[PDB]
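pasting for the record
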Amino acid sequence: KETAAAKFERQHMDSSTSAASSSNYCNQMMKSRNLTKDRCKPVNTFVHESLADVQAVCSQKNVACKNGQTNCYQSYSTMSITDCRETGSSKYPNCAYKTTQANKHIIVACEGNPYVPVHFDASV
């Protein structure tokens, strides 16, 4: 039984690589992480930092979420991220993604106890 916290980790964490070097990164990770069942997940972000470092964001800069909520936090520093976005030729079950690597601050929504990231809001 997957919790909100577990789902965030499966969908967004990639501590095992410091960055994505291959144009094929997204294609592989999207499939490995169970993100292409029934439909191709259109957009997804992978974070190349330790789990503890991402969890620490929950006590960082409080910001408004894109939905108007107040339980969003922004990392003080930029972090290693990889953006996966479905291409214009992607067609389920043949999901195709464009891989974009960059250093951005992340914005996550936090909940519970312990207070941890449950949703990936944005990158800036």
